Design an enzyme around this catalytic site. Structure first.
Site, short mmCIF file in Angstrom:
data_model
loop_
_atom_site.label_atom_id
_atom_site.label_comp_id
_atom_site.label_asym_id
_atom_site.label_seq_id
_atom_site.Cartn_x
_atom_site.Cartn_y
_atom_site.Cartn_z
N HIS A 244 -15.05 35.94 43.62
CA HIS A 244 -14.30 37.18 43.35
C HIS A 244 -12.89 37.10 43.87
O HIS A 244 -12.76 36.60 44.98
CB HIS A 244 -14.94 38.38 44.06
CG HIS A 244 -14.60 39.64 43.36
ND1 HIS A 244 -13.46 40.35 43.69
CD2 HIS A 244 -15.12 40.18 42.23
CE1 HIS A 244 -13.35 41.36 42.82
NE2 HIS A 244 -14.30 41.26 41.92
N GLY B 298 -8.57 47.51 39.60
CA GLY B 298 -8.54 48.87 40.13
C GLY B 298 -7.16 49.53 40.15
O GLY B 298 -6.85 50.21 41.13
N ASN C 249 -20.30 46.07 39.57
CA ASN C 249 -19.90 45.52 40.86
C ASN C 249 -19.57 46.67 41.83
O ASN C 249 -18.45 47.22 41.85
CB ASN C 249 -18.70 44.52 40.73
CG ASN C 249 -18.29 43.93 42.09
OD1 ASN C 249 -19.02 44.13 43.09
ND2 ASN C 249 -17.17 43.19 42.16
N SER D 297 -10.32 47.39 35.38
CA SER D 297 -10.10 48.77 34.94
C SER D 297 -10.79 49.14 33.63
O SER D 297 -10.29 49.96 32.87
CB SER D 297 -8.62 49.02 34.91
OG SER D 297 -8.11 48.78 36.19
N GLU E 63 -11.17 39.19 45.35
CA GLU E 63 -10.96 39.81 46.64
C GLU E 63 -11.31 38.83 47.73
O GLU E 63 -10.79 38.93 48.82
CB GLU E 63 -11.73 41.13 46.79
CG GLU E 63 -11.04 42.32 46.09
CD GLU E 63 -12.03 43.25 45.40
OE1 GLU E 63 -13.10 43.58 45.85
OE2 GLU E 63 -11.66 43.59 44.22
N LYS F 192 -19.04 46.54 44.86
CA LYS F 192 -18.14 46.04 45.88
C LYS F 192 -18.61 46.59 47.22
O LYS F 192 -19.81 46.62 47.47
CB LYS F 192 -16.73 46.48 45.56
CG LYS F 192 -16.25 45.81 44.29
CD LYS F 192 -14.75 45.94 44.06
CE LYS F 192 -14.37 45.26 42.76
NZ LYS F 192 -12.93 45.30 42.45
N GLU G 231 -11.13 38.13 35.10
CA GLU G 231 -10.58 39.31 35.72
C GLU G 231 -9.10 39.12 36.02
O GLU G 231 -8.76 38.62 37.08
CB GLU G 231 -11.23 39.44 37.11
CG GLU G 231 -12.70 39.85 37.03
CD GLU G 231 -13.13 40.63 38.24
OE1 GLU G 231 -12.53 40.76 39.31
OE2 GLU G 231 -14.28 41.15 38.01
O1 LIG Z 1 -13.21 47.68 37.34
P1 LIG Z 1 -12.26 47.65 38.56
O2 LIG Z 1 -10.82 47.95 38.20
O3 LIG Z 1 -12.74 48.45 39.77
O4 LIG Z 1 -12.33 46.08 38.94
C1 LIG Z 1 -13.60 45.41 38.84
C2 LIG Z 1 -13.78 43.98 39.34
O5 LIG Z 1 -12.72 43.51 40.22
C3 LIG Z 1 -15.14 43.74 39.93
O6 LIG Z 1 -15.81 42.87 39.01
#
Ligand SMILES: O=P(O)(O)OC[C@@H](O)CO
Lengths: 249, 249
Positions: free
Chosen positions: B94, B172, B10, B212, B96, B12, B166
């Site tokens: 998602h 993140g 992803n 993450s 977000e 993003k 998720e």
């Molecule tokens: O892997 P991250 O921490 O950037 O999070 C990933 C997800 O929110 C996108 O699928």
């Protein structure tokens, strides 16, 4: 005496490789003899196609929105992404976004300021709904829209800015905007600019009409003193968009 | 005897032509001996470049969002447009989007049913917030989310659905879910599916974990009974993604 006009096609959330290609072709073939800047605003998906195909010298490509910074914003496209991609025009604050997508006066200002900062030519959209209009609130809303944008911009910035007045009250409500009513909304904006920022800026400022424009009424709209061109939806997906370009002579 | 896994990148709201191209040359170079479906979800803007350059037989491109129907939605991109362009996979719901742009359980559900009717393979995200977790609402939060989607779907529809778990607090931050946390989440969801839809469906359904995930932590995650792969943000911008692919068979 007026500034350079703008004829902006907002294709909105429509399209097809096939169809658009064909429209593009009609556009490139068009004979345009006066000084006008033509803008084609395609979906994000179409941008690549659009750039490759549009060869007309009077045409530039524009995007229909952006977020200010890249990052964890799934589904969104940011300014930097657009900049690297060779796009330099943007439509911001459009009423459909204001309505469905949570775009307050504030979010719009930010996005605009963000764009100006990064070098984009911005077409910022303002305009009142039938409710605000009906209640005698036309002025407070419009001036509040432009004032919110204006608190984040220096005098110099203005040169990067184009305003589109959208008569929301006339859009999909059954009402008719006449040329007089468009002009008035426009004069008003111009007064605020002329009065708040300065006369010079004001005279150079482009105020596009972002209402119902067809090939038959575009010249009568243009004929008004504070109409600098158009931001177009429906007729933009049609060969008629050609008469609309012409109407800006 | 687990359904075929997925490693979904992803991106993003990130990238440049240069950088994404590199990643792509990297991916194209990698050999994968096991049955795995890799997915690249890039910005609308980069779909063109991705589709032209990505050549690996085990990869597919995805869109990060869309709306069900074309029309007057300035800034948006519809299912119809995506399908016309060659895109058959899409990430919906998602966090977000749910968080920032107001996507409610109902809105997501609508998008899924639509997408599924248009023949797309859909990765639908569900998950709880830091807050909900600490409150002890996790089980409620996630079952409701899934249940909202189930509502609009018919039994055969599920063959086109992929669920991504998720946990928001893991997005993140570096706060990965532990294997136990992810496996108890994943098992809960699947017990609802088997109970409501049917054991067959549950047996075939892929439930992805995101939050993450990285080169190092992916293996143990995957070792869990109910973990079928990953949906990855940050690490998907790096070569590390390669290792994540390798952890899933
Ligand atoms: O892997 P991250 O921490 O950037 O999070 C990933 C997800 O929110 C996108 O699928």
């Amino acid at each position: 005496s007026k500034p350079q006009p703008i004829a902006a096609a907002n294709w909105k959330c429509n399209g097809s490789q096939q169809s658009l290609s064909e429209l593009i072709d009609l556009f490139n073939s068009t004979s345009i003899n006066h000084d006008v800047q033509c803008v084609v605003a395609s979906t994000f998906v179409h941008l690549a196609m659009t750039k490759e195909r549009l060869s007309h010298p009077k045409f530039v490509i524009a995007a229909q929105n952006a977020i200010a910074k890249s990052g964890a914003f799934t589904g969104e496209v940011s300014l930097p992404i657009l900049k690297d991609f060779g796009v330099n025009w943007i439509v911001l604050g459009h009423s459909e976004r204001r309505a469905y997508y949570g775009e307050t006066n504030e979010i719009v200002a930010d996005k605009v300021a963000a764009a100006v900062a990064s070098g984009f030519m911005v077409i910022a959209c303002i305009g009142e709904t039938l409710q605000e209009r009906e209640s005698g609130r036309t002025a407070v809303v419009v001036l509040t829209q432009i004032a919110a944008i204006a608190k984040k911009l220096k005098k110099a910035d203005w040169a990067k800015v184009v305003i589109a007045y959208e008569p929301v009250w006339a859009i999909g409500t059954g009402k008719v905007a006449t040329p007089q009513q468009a002009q008035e909304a426009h004069a008003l904006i111009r007064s605020w600019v002329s009065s708040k920022i300065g006369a010079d800026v004001a005279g150079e400022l482009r105020i596009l009409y972002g209402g119902s424009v067809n090939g038959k009424n575009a010249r009568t709209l243009y004929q008004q003193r504070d109409v600098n061109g158009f931001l177009v939806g429906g007729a933009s997906l049609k060969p008629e968009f050609v008469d609309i370009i012409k109407a800006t002579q």
